[PDB]
């Protein structure tokens, strides 16, 4: 007894090699090793005929394509002067503000990210033929659809990733298919006679994509799952961590909209996206691991983990997936501490780089809504600032769209809350978004949804308070200037429509205390929540408001109504009688020295097209941008401009001086 | 029947790594080309009797490769050369021309 030592003898190539492996020495310094367990798994006394039959049971890739891929430089060199932070030792005396350089050490970051430990290669049927049972510090992404009839596991480590598909046919004969991505040198150890070359589908100079399955399971999976592993591996190797995360996020966002994941099908693209979610979560951990005992700049970590946080939320929405691991509490403490150094109300008074950096830190330090609602005041402060410096009615620029997209997630998180303490700021954010949702913006977003570019991923129209965006109007606002194919355009209109469904928890009001004053909600066109007043602009009369105007529309052409609600307190009943006329104003001087319209709204519509623009007069600059441009075109008699005031009055601007 | 056999343990025979102290491996051109290993008993005691049991060399080599990898942070360099030699030997042996 008392396992001590084994001697290995080799007669290879003449000279006799003799080695001595002492069990008791390397067993006392490696506590997580069991030699007898691997000896049992080995089946050392298995005959060659039986080993051969186990070997033929497993499907083998007939042809391995050699593609040369260029992996990028993800983590930059440590910035000179960066304070190094131990993820385990983070105190308030750590980095002062968002301008002082900082980086987190890689080793304690990895110890916190891959904190949990578990079995990665189970003793289940398909894996037990080829792999030895492996148990490591891991982090998994698990999801299931069709009521446990389809399951995907996304177990991963700092060195390789294994995604396992399992399908139950409701009668038996579970089908399992595993894909292993990672460095060819870091791949797990194989069992028995199996060799890695005969199992890799795609391979690079340093990376490999292995497939582990049986011939029967392979032929069964092939009827409904034929993925393009070449391009999949190519993106997994060549793309950066944050870019790959954003790519998978855009795929899932287009899937969530257009009603794709309410009844998820066992489609090839679906399972492909399931694997790509695991790869997205794996590339960040792998990049941190490839820089052992170094440190990662805080800006790179902020970007990557913002992307991962958003991706986690979306997979929790569509599939109710679970992500255990890949979350350092030290990074969260650091981000939440940096959040106390900048005041939210003036976050827009900073650099665009600083705004995006603060917003990424905001969603990373406070990932769950309801802990610190003040972050909404920050995001609004960004949007407000952008709205002041953005050309009126023009589509959003790429940089601005990305900034507003990074900021929009705290708002989306708070709009889904059943009770909030930041109602007014949500109202201001949604009013600003309604103001920014012009015809050019809708056209650019439709073009981005058609072409599949980054313009369609986010838009202020998605948080706008516009309810007059049916298909017949979206098609009219479709660009049609580019050579569009009317198929992508139809699907883009349908997707843009679905993203605005009020069935979405962030689309129904639930936070505009005046949305209850309406009795025919299917006829609401717009909601303008100003200060001390909210205007319900609808094509119906039954609105329990404080007054009732009727605008000038062409005969038999879907009349327009504006019902103001003071203090968001509904009336005891619908204001009966005859709707009052909108007073025309001609004596407004075009020259102004003070912001006399500050806090008001300016709505231009058409007699047979509908609502056209919406402006929130938020500063002297915006007022002068409106008065001193071609915005007022009194020559066109079909366009009417309405001014909405804070005491509930609606005027019609028909002349100036 | 290359140079010995691989008869599987009958369902009353017990084998344990604790009672094995010497393992002999075969090259790809020593025997007919199959990977066979021979496990030996301690060769100790009176009259110095020893018992041997042939086994699949591929499984032995894969076992020891995984063993040396799972504890590479404790390899003394001697076992590092052993790991390289075992990997090369396992790569020399090949299948599907065995059938």
């Amino acid at each position, epitope marked *: 007894a008392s396992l001590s030592e084994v001697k290995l003898h080799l007669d290879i*190539e003449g000279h006799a090699s003799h080695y001595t492996i002492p069990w008791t020495e390397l067993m006392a310094k490696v506590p997580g090793l069991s030699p007898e367990a691997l000896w049992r798994e080995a089946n050392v006394t298995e005959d060659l005929a039986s080993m051969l039959n186990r070997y033929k049971l497993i499907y083998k890739t007939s042809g391995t394509l050699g593609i040369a891929l260029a992996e990028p430089v993800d983590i930059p060199a440590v910035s000179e002067g960066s304070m190094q932070v131990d993820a385990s030792k983070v105190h308030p005396g750590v980095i002062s503000g968002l301008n002082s350089p900082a980086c987190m050490l890689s080793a304690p970051l990895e110890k916190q990210l891959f904190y949990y430990i578990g079995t990665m290669l189970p003793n289940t049927r398909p894996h037990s033929y080829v792999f030895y049972q492996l148990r490591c510090h891991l982090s998994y992404v698990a999801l299931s659809i069709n009521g446990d009839k389809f399951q995907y596991t996304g177990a991963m480590t700092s060195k390789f990733l294994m995604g396992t598909y399992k399908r139950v046919t409701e009668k038996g004969d579970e089908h399992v298919l595993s894909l292993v991505f990672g460095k060819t040198k870091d791949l797990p150890d194989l069992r028995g006679p199996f060799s890695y070359p005969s199992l890799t589908s795609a391979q690079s100079g340093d990376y490999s994509l292995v497939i582990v399955t049986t011939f029967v399971h392979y032929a069964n999976f092939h009827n409904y799952f034929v993925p393009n592993l070449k391009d999949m591996f190519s993106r997994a190797v060549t793309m950066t961590a944050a870019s790959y995360a954003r790519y998978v996020l855009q795929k899932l966002v287009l899937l969530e909209m257009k009603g794709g994941c309410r009844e998820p099908e066992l489609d090839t693209e679906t399972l492909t996206t399931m694997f790509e979610v695991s790869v997205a979560f794996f590339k960040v951990g792998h990049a941190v691991g490839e820089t052992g005992n170094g440190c990662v700049d805080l800006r790179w970590l902020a970007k990557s983990f913002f992307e991962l946080t958003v991706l986690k939320d979306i997979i929790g929405i569509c599939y109710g997936a679970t992500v255990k691991g890949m979350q350092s509490y030290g990074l969260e403490r650091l981000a939440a501490m940096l959040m106390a150094t900048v005041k939210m109300e003036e976050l827009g008074h900073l650099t665009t780089e600083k705004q995006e950096y603060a917003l990424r830190l905001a969603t990373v330090g406070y990932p769950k809504a309801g802990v610190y609602s003040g972050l909404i005041g920050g995001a609004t402060s960004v949007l407000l600032s952008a709205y002041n410096r953005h050309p009126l009615f023009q589509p959003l620029h790429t940089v601005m769209r990305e900034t507003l997209f990074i900021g929009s997630h705290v708002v989306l998180r708070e709009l889904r809350l059943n009770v909030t303490t930041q109602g007014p700021n949500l109202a201001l954010y949604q009013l600003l978004s309604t103001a920014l949702c012009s015809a050019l913006e809708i056209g650019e977003v439709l073009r981005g949804l058609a072409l599949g570019t980054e313009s369609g991923l986010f838009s202020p129209c998605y948080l706008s308070l516009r309810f007059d965006l049916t298909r017949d109007k979206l098609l009219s606002m479709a660009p049609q200037e580019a050579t569009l194919d009317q198929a992508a355009v139809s699907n883009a209109v349908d997707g843009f429509l679905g993203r605005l469904s009020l069935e979405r928890e962030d689309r129904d009001a639930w936070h505009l205390p005046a949305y209850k004053c309406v009795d025919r909600l299917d006829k609401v066109l717009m909601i303008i929540p100003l200060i001390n007043v909210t205007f319900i602009i609808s094509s119906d009369r039954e609105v329990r408001g404080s007054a009732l105007y009727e605008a000038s529309t062409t005969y038999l052409s879907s009349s327009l109504f504006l019902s103001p609600v003071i203090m968001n307190k509904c009336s005891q009943g619908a204001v009966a009688g005859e709707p009052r006329q909108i007073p025309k104003i001609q004596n407004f001087t075009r020259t102004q020295k003070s912001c006399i319209f500050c806090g008001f709204a300016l709505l231009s519509y058409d007699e047979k097209e509908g609502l056209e623009t919406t402006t929130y007069i938020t500063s002297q600059e915006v007022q002068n941008s409106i008065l001193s441009s071609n915005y007022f075109d009194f020559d066109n008699l079909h366009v009417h401009y309405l001014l909405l005031t804070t005491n509930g009055t609606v005027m019609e601007i028909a002349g100036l001086y | 029947y290359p140079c010995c056999h691989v008869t599987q343990l009958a369902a009353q025979h017990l084998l344990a790594l604790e009672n094995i102290s010497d393992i002999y491996l075969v090259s790809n051109q020593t025997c007919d080309g199959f990977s066979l290993a021979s496990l030996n008993s301690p060769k100790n005691g009176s009259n110095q009797l020893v018992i041997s049991r042939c086994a699949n060399g591929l499984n032995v080599v894969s076992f020891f490769i995984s063993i040396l990898k799972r504890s590479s942070s404790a390899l003394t360099g001697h076992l590092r050369e052993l790991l390289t030699t075992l990997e090369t030997l396992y790569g020399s042996f090949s299948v599907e021309d065995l059938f």
Partner: antibody
Amino acid sequence: GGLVKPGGSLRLSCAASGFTFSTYAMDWVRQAPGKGLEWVSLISSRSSNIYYSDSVKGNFTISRDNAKNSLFLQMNSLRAEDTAVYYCAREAGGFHSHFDMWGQGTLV
Amino acid sequence: SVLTQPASVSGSLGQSVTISCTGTSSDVGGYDYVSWYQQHPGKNPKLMIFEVNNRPSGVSTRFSGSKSGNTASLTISGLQAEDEADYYCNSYSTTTTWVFGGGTSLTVLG
């Protein structure tokens, strides 16, 4: 030939033709006026592995030719830190660490 | 490198002689592959000890070795009739793939 300076290039031959079997490993062991034995180099039967010494006595290139019944060795001369009598050695075989067949050795 | 070997063979033709050869943990103390070499004073090598204790099939007289712990002693009986030569010991050493001994010269008295 032989008898070179503290900088030399002499080609030594280990030609031994005992039988028609040349599928073993070979070695070089060297002697001097000082009574002592020291090993230098080794080649494989299938010449895929080659070993040399690792001290103030290192040494230089050896080869082998399966189709000409020979193993060969070339050496640099350190004179003072170099010997003169180089013997041949033939490795035993599988799981045996020693030599059986030998040679007479070459000149000064 | 060097394996220590003791000089000064003795014996009044009693047909018995004993000389050790101590080694390290990687050559003698932990591996059963060790050999000796005497053969003559004009030519040094001949096997003369196949293993720790094994004899080649030419030396029928009593030649044997101990290999107790970190030392390999040598016991010879039937070569006690001639002034033959020096003896050497070697083994498979993991540190350096081969290693030899310091030398033990032999001649019988009487």
